[PDB]
Amino acid sequence: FPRPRICNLACRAGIGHKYPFCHCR
């Protein structure tokens, strides 16, 4: 699965835990 561009932003802002599809840091 390709890494969604949003997931990148999410990780940076640390809103990963906020975005289900981008459950990053």
From Swiss-Prot:
Localisation per UniProt entry: Secreted
Modified residues (Arginine amide): R25
Highest taxon listed in the record's lineage: Eukaryota
Disulphide-bonded residues: C7-C22, C11-C24
Tissues and organs where the protein is expressed, per its UniProt entry: Expressed by the venom duct.
Transmembrane parts of this sequence: none
Domains: entry comment: The cysteine framework is XIV (C-C-C-C).
Role description: Highly inhibits both nicotinic acetylcholine receptors (neuronal (IC(50)=8.7 uM for alpha-3/beta-4) and muscular (IC(50)=0.54 uM for alpha-1-beta-1-epsilon-delta (CHRNA1-CHRNB1-CHRND-CHRNE)) subtypes) and the voltage-gated potassium channel Kv1.6/KCNA6 subtype (IC(50)=1.59 uM).
Family designation: Belongs to the conotoxin J superfamily.
Misc remark: No or very small inhibition is observed on Kv1.1/KCNA1, Kv1.2/KCNA2, Kv1.3/KCNA3, Kv1.4/KCNA4, Kv1.5/KCNA5 and Nav1.2/SCN2A.
Protein name: Alpha/kappa-conotoxin pl14a
Organism (species): Conus planorbis
